[model samples]
Target: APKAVLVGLPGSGKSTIGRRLAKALGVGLLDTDVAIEQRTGRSIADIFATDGEQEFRRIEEDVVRAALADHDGVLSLGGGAVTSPGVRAALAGHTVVYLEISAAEGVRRTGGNTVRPLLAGPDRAEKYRALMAKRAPLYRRVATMRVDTNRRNPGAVVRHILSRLQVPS
Candidate 1:
């Protein structure tokens, strides 16, 4: 029921742009990661550390599916949600926007962030590059539109998305 769904890497400005876009369009905003944390009563970092990535993903899939069905506004997904087959399937026929960013940008934005469990390794840049290389196709596959976030501010990104969707601001 969402008017639009935003998908991208962790630092792709989904939450920031989603809030602005929802306000511009006079709608609500639902961030799946926040939803999951709220529902589970745990931080994502704690969930990942204690429950493991697979468990966190299972919870994420459930939360995303429910949000997709119930949110009639703008919904932003976790960075890796699109990698889940069920999540991708659920996105069909919806307004799915991929907020694309370069691997370097992703690393720059997420580096030194301990909250991101997946990026917690000696070679974070390499991991980011490899992850993006693997997930880019999936994001492209599910996205109805792609907006580049490199060198663009959140406002500009939101405006570009609105323009692409032909939504008056």
Candidate 2:
């Protein structure tokens, strides 16, 4: 029952890739965002819209702790989940993978998606760039392994990760 955690910016394919990785590893996939929604009775976008980013982050942190406590699956967290010092601390001993994607790629994948509350505002591209700039260092700091996912397909990226970890599928 090992835990492998995926952390990345929104639209970076963490959930999509996590599911495939889990299937390859013959393990379960637990997306913390879904856990948060189930716990709060609201989607992450809705929580951010109604309660604000701070509240959403708080709930994200809580759900992360719960995931680590309650699940033995491959866990994928929200883009900003690492902002919480406590969550970062908790990730110290885990198998943490970071999916590094360019801001342009992120924008391409998520352009004007209303499901993302943070990106629904005017100047969303600018805001997204700033957010990526702010979180890049943190992501690099905490990742035990890093995968550049800009041009790679999900299967190739997953293979690269498995190779890096000497984990054969």
Candidate 3:
């Protein structure tokens, strides 16, 4: 079984905190996005651009399905991984943690990356607000625990996860 699976937006510190979480637990960190990129031999953007989003989703689902079975350490999923109903279903098998970040904080953290589709306008925070609103339900449904990363430092967040879950770290 997996120790933990992190799910959240780009600025939520999934990767950075995941490394710390895994290190704290003396396990490894596995990220779905990195795994996807590794297998396809291309960047996630390259995969999406070259193969198409639908194809990327297809590969994403399979890779996730496999990771869920094989990985027994801390895992971080892609920001949009839960959009696929299949990924949502696969999440049922693990202790999924939602790293919640407020819209203002998340936007500030991400710097309104112009590359993101929804962050196209001046009201990028507004767009981020709506995106989180829409995706909030899914994250809630998939997560066994929710930790607000907005106020805490990464070390504090890791401590919170360990305290809340009582994982044998």
Candidate 4:
């Protein structure tokens, strides 16, 4: 029953935009990755390193599942959480917004020193392109709406969403 759930790659501004949108709506915000780290006592990278992606994904799905079922405000999911069928299934009919950042733009925002490290190394731009190729469809499939982040600031993005949702602007 959340008002909005933001999904996108790491630097696609989910956290920042979610904060603004939630503040504008006067509702709480939950970044599922933060919730996961707090709940599990480990960073997401550490979880992936130690227990592997399958385990991390298991935890991610559980946290997102609970948030979707319970949170009444705004939520932002981790970059790859939508890859989970369970997570996608749980998103049906929700106000899921996909922060669509095109490949070069996405790389510029996330590649240089991405916290995720999935886009690290010499070929970061290329890696990001491939990752988007695999993930964009999932994002599109689950998104109730798509908002381009390439040309929008966080405030603009928030306003755009509110405008689209027909909230008083």
Which consecutive 10 residues in model 1 have the weakest lDDT in total? Answer: 111-120
**What is the per-residue lDDT of model 4 for residues 32-109, given as tens digits with 9 covering 90 to 100?**
999999999998779977888889999999999999989999999999999999999999989889998988787777
* TM-score list, all predictions: 0.93, 0.92, 0.90, 0.94
What ranges in model 1 sit over 4 Å off? 112-114, 167-169
> 17-84, model 1: which lDDT tens digit per residue?
89999998899999998899899999999998898999999999999999998999999999889888
Better candidate number, 3 or 4, judged by TM-score: 4
Candidate 2 scores a C-alpha RMSD against the true structure in Å of 2.3
Each prediction's Cα RMSD?
Answer: 2.2, 2.3, 2.5, 2.1
| lDDT pick, better of 1 and 2 | 1
Against the unseen true structure, what C-alpha lDDT does each candidate score?
Answer: 0.90, 0.85, 0.87, 0.89
Which residue pairs in candidate 4 collide?
none
Between the candidate structures 1 and 4, which one is better when assessed by lDDT?
1
lDDT of 3 by residue, 89-130 (tens): 988968999999988888888894436543556787788888
Q: What TM-score does structure 1 among the candidates reach? A: 0.93
Off by over 4 Å in 4: 112-114, 167-169
- The clash number for model 1 is 0
